[PDB]
Amino acid sequence: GTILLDLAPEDKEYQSVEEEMQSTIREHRDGGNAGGIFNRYNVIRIQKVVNKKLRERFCHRQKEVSEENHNHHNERMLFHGSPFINAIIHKGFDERHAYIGGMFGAGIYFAENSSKSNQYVYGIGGGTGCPTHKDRSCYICHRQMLFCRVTLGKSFLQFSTIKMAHAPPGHHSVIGRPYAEYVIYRGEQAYPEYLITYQIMKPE
Numbered sequence: 001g002t003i004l005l006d007l008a009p010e011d012k013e014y015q016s017v018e019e020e021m022q023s024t025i026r027e028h029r030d031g032g033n034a035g036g037i038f039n040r041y042n043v044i045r046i047q048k049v050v051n052k053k054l055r056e057r058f059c060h061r062q063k064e065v066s067e068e069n070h071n072h073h074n075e076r077m078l079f080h081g082s083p084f085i086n087a088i089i090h091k092g093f094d095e096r097h098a099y100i101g102g103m104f105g106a107g108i109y110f111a112e113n114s115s116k117s118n119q120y121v122y123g124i125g126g127g128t129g130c131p132t133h134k135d136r137s138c139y140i141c142h143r144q145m146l147f148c149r150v151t152l153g154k155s156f157l158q159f160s161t162i163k164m165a166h167a168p169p170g171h172h173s174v175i176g177r178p179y180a181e182y183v184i185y186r187g188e189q190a191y192p193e194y195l196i197t198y199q200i201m202k203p204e
């Protein structure tokens with residue numbers, strides 16, 4: 001049982017999440033082919049995801065990661081876009097659904113930028129876009145993304161395109177740069193904290 005609690009737009013928590021979502025928009029070298037063309041989002045609602053079993057898996061793993069990393073779990077708030085967003089908020093993140101085609105190997109990817117996670121809301125390369133109008137830049141259909149708690153532990157900073165199946169010895173994640181891509185190889189190293197419902201906006 002998952003419970004979705006609506007945050008009020010007047011709430012400082014809602015405002016912090018939207019600020020983070022809006023302010024991390026950047027330009028992509030694909031000219032918005034995957035996510036669409038926009039400079040801003042229209043945030044419809046923001047919901048806190050509550051699930052006892054998911055919180056327990058996450059908290060149990062944070063404890064293990066801190067023991068291995070001098071009592072530091074090194075948690076970050078990172079974005080995630082997926083066409084499996086409903087399965088995440090009910091069953092959690094699953095490394096058995098790792099992104100094989102990723103630059104840093106078969107892991108679960110998170111972005112520091114909401115605009116990067118938006119390219120994956122309809123699948124790899126933006127897929128076929130919105131189910132209704134098969135448009136990767138649909139401004140009508142409501143999209144969804146997550147703003148997650150990510151247990152990075154001891155991160156391994158990678159610069160090359162070395163594909164890894166697991167984190168290097170002694171490490172709990174991979175940070176990749178040429179923006180930054182965060183990779184985790186265990187589903188229980190991320191909690192889907194907030195479910196953001198939004199639209200991409202057509203510039204005037």
Ligand SMILES: Cc1cccc2c(=O)[nH]c(-c3ccc(CN4CCNCC4)cc3)cc12
Pocket residue numbers: 079080081082083097098099100102109110111116117118120123124181182
């Ligand atoms: C590369 C990258 C960097 C930063 C952020 C992201 C992100 O938020 N999602 C995905 C992402 C999510 C889900 C899927 C879809 N499935 C399809 C079936 N195989 C597993 C992935 C693909 C990519 C990739 C990504």
Ligand SMILES: [Zn+2]
Pocket residue numbers: 130131132133134135138139140141
């Ligand atoms: Zn549409």
